[PDB]
Design a protein around this ligand. Structure first.
Ligand SMILES: CCCCC(=O)C1=C(O)C(=O)c2c(O)c(O)cc(O)c2C1=O
Ligand SMILES: [Cl-]
Ligand SMILES: [Mg+2]
Ligand SMILES: [Mn+2]
Length: 179
């Protein structure tokens, strides 16, 4: 109950509505699966923060879009470059280094998640980039895409959430709840 409260206090209304949508599409109730709610909100925020990271329109956002537009963006980019169309929707496209990006956000250790992602997606083409709430980060062939300045600004936001969750005692539960 106080997590739902937190979610609507801490996150911008656009992120909140996108999350509710994304959850209801799998039949999960945000008022009930409140730890998934917060987890989705955070993932989306990082995506949006990451996309502002570098040069102006360095990145095309794919996450947060409906499936048709999402795929329109993908199919369009593979048609005009020739980079292998992926088997799943990624999170961004990097116009500077011509590759898609999967972004992950983990409550566990950053190596455990990176493994699951790598095996989950296969397609050697795409890029992975994990963040934690404790400031850890792991990237594909250790290539961190953004500059250290913008990267820290994300990890700093992720920490404050961890703290502000802990402040309301919600964190202990939120950390055990990742599947
Ligand atoms: C299990 C198969 C279902 C697909 C799914 O729910 C996910 C996404 O669409 C997605 O876009 C996604 C991230 O972007 C992500 O960073 C972590 C994830 O765990 C997911 C997902 O798990
Ligand atoms: Cl807000
Ligand atoms: Mg969007
Ligand atoms: Mn992702």
């Amino acid at each position: 109950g106080s997590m739902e409260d937190f979610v609507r206090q801490c996150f911008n209304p656009m992120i909140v509505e996108l999350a509710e949508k994304a959850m209801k599409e799998y039949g999960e109730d945000p008022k009930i699966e409140t730890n998934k709610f917060a987890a989705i909100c955070t993932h989306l925020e990082v995506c949006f923060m990451y996309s502002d990271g570098g040069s102006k329109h360095r990145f095309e956002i794919i996450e947060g879009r409906d499936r048709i537009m999402a795929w329109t963006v993908v199919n369009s980019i593979c048609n005009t470059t020739g980079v292998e169309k992926p088997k799943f929707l990624p999170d961004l496209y990097d116009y500077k280094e011509n590759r898609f990006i999967e972004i992950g956000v983990t409550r566990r250790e950053v190596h455990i998640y990176y493994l699951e992602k790598a095996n989950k997606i296969k397609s050697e083409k795409t890029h992975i980039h994990i963040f934690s709430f404790t400031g850890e980060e792991m990237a594909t062939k250790a290539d961190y895409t953004l500059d250290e300045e913008s990267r820290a600004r994300i990890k700093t936001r992720l920490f404050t959430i961890r703290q502000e969750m802990a402040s309301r005692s919600l964190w202990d539960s939120f950390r055990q709840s990742e599947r």
